[PDB]
Amino acid sequence: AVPKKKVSHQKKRQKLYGPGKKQLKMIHHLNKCPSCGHYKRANTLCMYCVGQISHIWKTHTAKEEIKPRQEEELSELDQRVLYPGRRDTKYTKDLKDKDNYLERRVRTLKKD
């Protein structure tokens, strides 16, 4: 149930790193994407090219934003009177800074 001794430096290290099962393997199965000449996984789509195509689809197949007439044709002063500004909470501010906590996809290296 309980360790009888302080496990030594040797014995913890040979346990962890000695076996190949536990080690990380080289990703030999990279290959060139045909659409953009960059690294991608074998039997896998290029995340750049498919992303680009998805973006294209979004730009074309776009549901139009609903802008109400009455709010679109308000005067500036009138709009200010109706819908004044406010102090956002700390939480709200944190939520707003998305680049702080949201990871954008990195581009791979160009294949040789």
Partner 1 sequence: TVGIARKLSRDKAHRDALLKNLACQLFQHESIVSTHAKCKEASRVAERIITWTKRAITTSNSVAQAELKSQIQSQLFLAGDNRKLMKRLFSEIAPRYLERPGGYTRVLRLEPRANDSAPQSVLELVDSPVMSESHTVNRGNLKMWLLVKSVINDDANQLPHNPLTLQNLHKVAKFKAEAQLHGEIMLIKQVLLKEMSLPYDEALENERTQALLKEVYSSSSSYVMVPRP
> How many C-beta atoms surround the C-beta of residue 49 within 10 A?
15
- 108 labelled binding-site residue: no
Cβ burial of 35 (10 Å; 0-12, 13-18, 19+) is: middle
- Cβ 33 to Zn ion, closest distance in Å? 4
14: enclosing H helix or E strand: helix 9-17
Does 49 appear as a known binding residue?
A: yes
Question: Is residue 2 a contact point for RNA (CB under 7 A)?
Answer: yes
- The footprint of partner 1 (CB under 8 A) covers 34-37, 40-41, 43-47, 49-50, 52-53, 55-57, 60-61, 103
Return the closest-CA partner of residue 55 out of 105, 109, 99.
Answer: 105
Q: Binding to RNA by residue 19, rule CB under 7 A?
A: yes
Written as six digits, the tokens of 8 are: 């030594």
Determine whether the annotation assigns residue 78 to a binding site. Answer: no
Options 15, 93, 110, 111; binder of RNA; rule CB under 7 A: 15
The correct pick among 64, 72, 75, 89 for binding RNA (CB under 7 A) is: 89
3-state class percentages of the chain: helix first, strand second, coil last, to nearest 5: 35, 5, 55
Q: Which residues partner with 40 through β-bridges?
A: 31
Given RNA, partner 1, Zn ion, none, residue 96, with its beta carbon under 5 to 8 Å by kind, binds none
Binding residues (CB under 5 A) for Zn ion: these are 33, 35-36, 46, 48-49
